[model samples]
Target: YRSIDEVTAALSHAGLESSNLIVGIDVTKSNEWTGARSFGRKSLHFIGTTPNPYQQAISIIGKTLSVFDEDNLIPCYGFGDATTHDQDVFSFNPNDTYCNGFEEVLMCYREIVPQLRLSGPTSFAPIIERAMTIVEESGGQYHVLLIIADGQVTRSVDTDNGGFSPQEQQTIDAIVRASEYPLSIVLVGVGDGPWDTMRQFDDNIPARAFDNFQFVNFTDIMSKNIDPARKEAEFALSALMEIPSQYKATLELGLLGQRTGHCPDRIALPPP
Candidate 1:
């Protein structure tokens, strides 16, 4: 795991300047099912906020990236279980607060984090769906959506049949179908629980053969009995260090196919 400092340093070394980066925090808050009851808090808190693993990961990533240009970062907090009345499933743009572009968005994100609360059972599909809308609106400019979560898909009551409800599957299909600009998804799983359910949705792992996405399970590294700080740094290095390279390769492959009007022979086959 790379620390915020290391990530920033690596970005500088890569010579890849990012004008904008949007990060969405997903804390599995599913209202339909509650975990265990807490004596202090009437209900069990969702995994995202209470000593949240992803929260720490995101904080480090955001802070480190902010070091380069504080204004270009856009941090959005999204709940997966249900439609939040407080925070919507939408990208947080700087213009909403009169700030301009990515730099302003970063400032806004820093400010927003302190005020936000975490709640969810967890559904990655909606968060991705919302991001797709933003990607389309951006006219296919380079944009990356980082989602940190820990579990399978869960739908809100608002969604029908509870099967990738609320246009969840449709949004994913749309992203897969689009030919112009590219959309990239990164999933960082924080715990050791069985993530087989999540693997089904992740497109990054070559073994899994899903395209335009990446996944990393950090539980193993963290379980080695190391100090928390050391463990976190290791996790960052393992998961984040290769992001730029992965991003470049995915986009290049997609663009190459677009230009050649022929899908690359090396591309992974679609899942059955």
Candidate 2:
């Protein structure tokens, strides 16, 4: 896998030229465990920094996207215990805490990863809540949050073993309640543990199946036993296919209607 520095540099260079949509990415940390939690330990590596698989996967994604369509790429930020305390949100750019524009934000992401320490007791609710706050503050502009996590949600005591925490649920409810506006969440699971239980939060899945929110898992797609190139292709395809739909949803929400708030309405329109 490419080092964080290498990926960051590559994305920074690419961002200097192109104007692509920005998708914020956040990786969750691994959960703490005890001897009695042997099974939990087995799942830890799948989600936590022990193996740092999510880090590697996201880095690879940045590198690969740089090689092809760097300008159209959005920057990603690293989150969770390793980078912050109490579910703190960060941007690659040090000067700008939150992504200002897609390119500016992405550059910030590339700038930040090398400085973080990967630690865990992975939690999803806080990061999601943070993203929601950003979106809301942006006045409901169309934005997608790509969360790469392992295992299940641990931030909330009331959620099912694999569901969004109570706080997370509140944030989501707020977003959906404001569905008249625009916002979307895409969760990508890495590794092969029981992440299926967490699928409830993803809104993309059919309601008849599981419905809390919609998410796609990469357990089988990125299995250690599989071909790396093949896995990469699958991952790219999944993301590429979703981009159009995401953009379409953004426009439909009327985010591009008028320029107001922190960003101009034209901000939602594609870059020239």
Candidate 3:
């Protein structure tokens, strides 16, 4: 990318760089639903030992994000549970405040997941919109929306409902186009469902967000893989790599106006 002029440079130098990582979980039926003939793992092999999809997701994504940025401010939320259809459930108290660290974030996740009932069809537009609201409120900042969901395709226009029909894509397209909202969304597909629908979101579609969206299937990168950490890191960076470009785009548009301070744009690279 090219450099900004003097006056604008200072504004750029004012460090328009900031990122808010919002973690979201799916509390819907598929998320908690045990597979076929399941009665408390009576027939299952790995009983009481494995972390559920959401739990593993929280640990991996939450921990990585916590250490990546200096601040431990992670606001977490949940969707798709009929119980919370009318209510908002936060992982921590007072959605506005930040957690001390990943430990606190995990504590919040552990406590909140059980209390809620997993109900209703899957939807992510709500969570994405909420995350955008937070980023917009900050004004001139980068944001990451980390969503761990049991990707189930509910609505579709074409024959068998391929992932993210026209209308849904339109909503996402609108949200992503807002240059003022400098944000990236990382989708972690968990649970036993095919997750093929989830993959298509990240698949190359015309103007379907070149760098802003990423999807990783949990099973593919789990311990079964020889170098699990490497696999995870690779996928994460692919998602995160968009930040630099998005940050520049926001500055080019002068969305936040010229101000001077420090730039927190450089996110820490994870260990190999």
Model 3 residue 88 CA deviation (Å) reads: 6.6
lDDT of each: 0.48, 0.45, 0.54
* Cα RMSD (angstroms) for every candidate in the order listed: 8.8, 9.3, 10.0
lDDT ranking from best candidate downward = 3, 1, 2
- Candidate number with greatest TM-score: 3
Candidate 1 segments exceeding 4 Å error: 1-3, 27-51, 67-70, 81-122, 155-180, 197-210, 250-272
lDDT of 2 by residue, 67-87 (tens): 334334353454554545334
Q: Judge candidate 1 at residue 53 and give its lDDT.
A: 51
Choose 2 or 3, whichever is better by lDDT. 3
lDDT of 3 at 90: 38
* 204-236 per-residue lDDT for model 1 (tens digits): 223312255666665566567887666766765
User: Which 10 successive residues of model 1 have the least lDDT summed?
Assistant: 263-272
lDDT of 3 by residue, 32-117 (tens): 44333222422111224565556656666555454445466776777667644312333443344656665676676666555565
Best by lDDT: 3
Clashes of each: 21, 19, 0
TM-score of each: 0.59, 0.55, 0.68
